[PDB]
Design a protein around this ligand. Structure first.
Ligand SMILES: CS(=O)(=O)NCCc1ccc(F)cc1
Ligand SMILES: [Zn+2]
Ligand SMILES: [Zn+2]
Ligand SMILES: [Zn+2]
Length: 572
């Protein structure tokens, strides 16, 4: 019961019993919280509650210190001091923002704005509170029981009455019953277990709610600038391949942390792996939120770094298949590749945290808590997609509010910027450069003359809330007959149900905009599907069209983004 105030660090015995996490609040801060919010339960060794038998007064504003015990107005002795008076709550060792974080429901974008504009201490209070709120919300959903098993990838489910049914996408990972994690995709539905199992009727699925651990480290350590490269030893013999990044590699060694904004195909993996070749004796931990982001760093490392000094850290509670070429779970190898949630407690000369738009402040803090490093490098792009905020339903979350790193990149600018896109045909580069890069992204490739746009609203149908546009798929089908080279295209849309329909009608491999991030394909066929805030999001639009190396066909619903596409328009 003795700790430090979450706002001003002043030692105290008081914790807010009404807050979901129970933060310690000093006398002068606890008061300003109880007096401005519905939160009135104050806890010390024992709660501030009326000691009189059978009395239910818990509100600290209605309580007094009667000698050594606590009583309300109705039970206090003659000589009794109010627990609440003179700007303080009585405690040992004798905030408008803390109040909003403590009481919000995390459904508004303004909640996330505050969680990123508040003091560092409140960014951790905000991140822990949010995550606990998200986990308790999983309990709201109804249990899914197997009614019948059709095939090895198809079943029919029975849902709990009186409780809502969770969305059926890859975002929502169930737990079978303890037959391993399972996912669903759309009366026939597609089942997919992280463990292969002969689906038994009666077996049920629940979204696994995980215990939210406390946060201790800041999202960003305090910045330090150095006059020389510190604790790192550069090479003179540096491969011409990486010569373009030498000045930025030196910048990395002359600051405690650095931010790198890398638009699509500008050389983020190449930069990250080249940092290892520039400081050859440095121990580097390569981290990211997703297994796909960590695997892409492994792939680039396989090509340039000694395979014997690499290790892929895999949590024994294996969910999806990941990179199999390095020695597994060797925490002490010079190069360690690991997701944030699986990071061991270790030190490093450099920590490289990739795909930073996908990180939350909870992730930023966990990295600073598990890894003690001489230098930290944050790689990503605030113009790409952030992590899904399952509770957020009102308002759009801007890039400067994704996390502390993205906030810094959008306000003071990134420390380093990769300005040349080597992946995309110039039509795509020119469009996204104007759309989200303030005209600073330059094209390496020429215009491919294989980038097309078609304005076709079609017809929007819905599978629950996930959207389908069958006429936009029909327009694609007609295009494919006339453009057989496009047979090899990856179909992309902002909706899984649209992708399910295009998979059966077109036979192309399918990908949501969100799951395509980090990947590249020679040809992309994109159907916007709808003109909603989701399908019109500039970050999602940016990711969707920058997946293409050679050609792209965009069937658009929104006149605005259609007009912005610097593509050859098609007719039908
Ligand atoms: C119990 S909590 O309020 O939910 N989380 C505390 C986060 C924190 C930890 C250390 C600090 F120096 C500042 C804040
Ligand atoms: Zn409270
Ligand atoms: Zn305080
Ligand atoms: Zn009483």
């Amino acid at each position: 019961a003795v700790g430090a105030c979450v706002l001003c660090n002043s030692q105290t015995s008081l914790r807010c019993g009404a807050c979901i996490r129970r933060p310690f609040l000093c006398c002068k801060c606890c008061y300003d919280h109880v007096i401005s919010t519905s939160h009135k339960l104050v806890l010390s060794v024992n709660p501030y509650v009326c000691n009189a038998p059978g009395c239910d007064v818990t509100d600290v504003t209605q309580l007094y210190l009667g000698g050594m015990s606590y009583y309300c107005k109705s039970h206090k002795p003659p000589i009794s001091f109010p627990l609440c008076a003179n700007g303080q709550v009585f405690g040992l060792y004798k905030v408008t923002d803390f109040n909003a974080i403590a009481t919000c429901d995390w459904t508004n974008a303004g909640d996330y704005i505050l969680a990123n504009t508040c003091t560092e201490r409140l960014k951790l209070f905000a991140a822990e509170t949010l995550k606990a709120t998200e986990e308790t919300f999983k309990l709201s959903y109804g249990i899914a029981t197997v009614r019948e098993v059709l095939s090895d990838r198809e079943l029919h489910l029975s849902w709990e009455v009186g409780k809502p049914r969770p969305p059926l996408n890859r975002n929502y990972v169930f737990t079978g019953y303890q037959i391993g994690e399972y996912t669903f995709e759309k009366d026939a539905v597609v089942y997919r277990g992280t463990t292969t199992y002969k689906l038994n009727v009666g077996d049920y699925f629940v979204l696994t709610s995980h215990t939210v651990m406390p946060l201790s480290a800041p999202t960003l350590v305090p910045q330090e600038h150095y006059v020389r490269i510190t604790g790192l030893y550069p090479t003179l013999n540096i491969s011409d391949e990486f010569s373009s990044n030498v000045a930025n590699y030196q910048k990395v060694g002359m600051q405690k942390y650095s931010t790198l904004q890398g638009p699509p195909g500008t050389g983020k993996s190449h930069f990250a792996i080249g940092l290892a070749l520039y400081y050859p004796s440095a121990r580097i931990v390569y981290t990211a939120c997703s297994h796909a982001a960590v695997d892409a760093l492994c792939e680039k490392a396989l090509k340039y770094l000694p395979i014997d000094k690499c290790s892929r850290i895999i949590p024994a509670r294996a969910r999806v298949e990941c990179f199999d070429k390095f020695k597994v779970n060797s925490t002490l190898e010079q190069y360690v590749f690991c997701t944030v949630n699986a990071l061991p407690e270790t030190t490093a000369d450099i920590v490289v945290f990739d795909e930073i738009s996908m990180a939350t402040n909870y992730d930023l803090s966990v990295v600073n808590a598990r890894l003690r490093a001489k230098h930290y490098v944050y790689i990503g792009d605030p113009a790409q997609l952030p992590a899904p905020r399952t509770l957020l339903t009102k308002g759009t979350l801007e890039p400067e509010y994704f996390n502390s790193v993205c906030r810094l990149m959008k306000t003071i600018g990134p420390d380093m910027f990769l300005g040349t896109c080597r992946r995309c045909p110039a039509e795509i580069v020119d469009t996204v450069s104007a759309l989200v890069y303030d005209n600073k992204l330059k094209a390496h490739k020429d215009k491919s003359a294989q980038c097309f746009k078609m304005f076709y609203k079609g017809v929007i149908t819905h599978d629950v809330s996930s959207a389908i546009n069958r006429p936009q798929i029909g327009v694609v089908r007609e295009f494919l007959t006339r453009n057989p080279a496009w047979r090899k295209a990856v179909f992309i849309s902002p909706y899984n149900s649209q992708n399910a329909v295009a998979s059966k009608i077109l036979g192309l491999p399918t990908q949501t905009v969100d799951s395509s991030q980090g990947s590249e394909y020679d040809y992309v066929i994109f159907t916007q599907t709808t003109e909603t805030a989701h399908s019109c999001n500039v970050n999602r639009f940016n990711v969707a069209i920058t997946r293409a190396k050679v050609g792209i066909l965009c069937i658009m619903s929104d006149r605005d983004l259609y007009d912005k596409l610097q593509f050859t328009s098609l007719e039908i």
